[PDB]
From Swiss-Prot:
Assembly, per entry: Interacts with p53/TP53; the interaction is direct. Interacts (via CTD region) with CDK9 and CCNT1, acting as an associated component of P-TEFb complex. Interacts with RELA (when acetylated at 'Lys-310'). Interacts (via NET domain) with NSD3, CHD4, BICRA and ATAD5. The interaction with BICRA bridges BRD4 to the GBAF complex. Interacts (via NET domain) with JMJD6 (via JmjC and N-terminal domains); the interaction is stronger in presence of ssRNA and recruits JMJD6 on distal enhancers. Interacts with NSD3. Interacts with NIPBL. (Microbial infection) Interacts with bovine papillomavirus type 1 regulatory protein E2. This interactions may serve for the tethering of viral genomes to host mitotic chromosomes allowing successful partitioning of the viral genome during cell division.
Shown chain mapped onto the complete sequence: 44 to 168 of 1362
Note: JQ1, a thieno-triazolo-1,4-diazepine derivative, and I-BET, a benzodiazepine derivative, have been tested on tumors with success. Treatment with GSK1210151A (I-BET151, a I-BET derivative) has strong effets on mixed lineage leukemia and promotes myeloid differentiation and leukemia stem-cell depletion.
Cross-link (Glycyl lysine isopeptide (Lys-Gly) (interchain with G-Cter in SUMO2)): K58
Site (Acetylated histone binding): N99
Effect ascribed to mutating D104G: Found in a patient with a neurodevelopmental syndrome; uncertain significance
Domain called Bromo: residue spans: 17-123
Domain notes from UniProt: The NET domain mediates interaction with a number of chromatin proteins involved in transcription regulation (NSD3, JMJD6, CHD4, GLTSCR1 and ATAD5). The C-terminal (CTD) region mediates interaction and recruitment of CDK9 and CCNT1 subunits of the P-TEFb complex. It is also required for maintenance of higher-order chromatin structure.
Protein function: Chromatin reader protein that recognizes and binds acetylated histones and plays a key role in transmission of epigenetic memory across cell divisions and transcription regulation. Remains associated with acetylated chromatin throughout the entire cell cycle and provides epigenetic memory for postmitotic G1 gene transcription by preserving acetylated chromatin status and maintaining high-order chromatin structure. During interphase, plays a key role in regulating the transcription of signal-inducible genes by associating with the P-TEFb complex and recruiting it to promoters.
UniProt PTM: Phosphorylation by CK2 disrupt the intramolecular binding between the bromo domain 2 and the NPS region and promotes binding between the NPS and the BID regions, leading to activate the protein and promote binding to acetylated histones. In absence of phosphorylation, BRD4 does not localize to p53/TP53 target gene promoters, phosphorylation promoting recruitment to p53/TP53 target promoters.
Organism of origin: Homo sapiens
Similarity comment: Belongs to the BET family.
Protein encoded by which gene: BRD4
Noted disease: Cornelia de Lange syndrome 6: A form of Cornelia de Lange syndrome, a clinically heterogeneous developmental disorder associated with malformations affecting multiple systems. It is characterized by facial dysmorphisms, abnormal hands and feet, growth delay, cognitive retardation, hirsutism, gastroesophageal dysfunction and cardiac, ophthalmologic and genitourinary anomalies. CDLS6 inheritance is autosomal dominant.
Protein known as: Bromodomain-containing protein 4
Subcellular location: Nucleus; Chromosome
Length: 127
């Protein structure tokens, strides 16, 4: 029923790069999803204590959220864009795994994911 420590957003021994694809993931994908009307449940880790969801982290073992993604992009945490894409996809998957189908929270995840796929469809060419 307690909250776990959040996902790591800084690892100085982890090699990093500043690429046009990673810049796109911040300037376009993260910003588009962040300003969305349905973004707010995904802007920070699930607070299982205040939400009284004691089984959330019993079930969700790779928690992920756009607050964590944002910090990772700002801290230049990633080596490539696929890592960051995987974080987004894990956050959507967590929501679909934990919640019942037809829940409003699932509809919010779906709306954000639709936009996500639209932006990733036009990921720029490297270099
Ligand atoms: C992704 C998510 N965000 C949130 C959420 C997270 C914070 N921190 C605040 C308010 C909400 Cl709705 C939830 C969820 C769930 O999946 C579980 C159902 C409701 C809680």
């Amino acid at each position: 029923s307690m909250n776990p420590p959040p996902p790591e957003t800084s690892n100085p021994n982890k090699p990093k790069r500043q690429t046009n694809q990673l810049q796109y993931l911040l300037r376009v994908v993260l910003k588009t999803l962040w300003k969305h009307q349905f973004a707010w449940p995904f802007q920070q880790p699930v607070d299982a204590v205040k939400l009284n969801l004691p089984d959330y982290y019993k079930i969700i073992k790779t928690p992920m959220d756009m607050g964590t993604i944002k910090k990772r992009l700002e801290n230049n945490y990633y080596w490539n864009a696929q890592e960051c894409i995987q974080d987004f996809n894990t956050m959507f998957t967590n929501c679909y795994i934990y919640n019942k189908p037809g829940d409003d929270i699932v509809l919010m995840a779906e709306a954000l994911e639709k936009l996500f796929l639209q932006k990733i469809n036009e990921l720029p060419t490297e270099e």
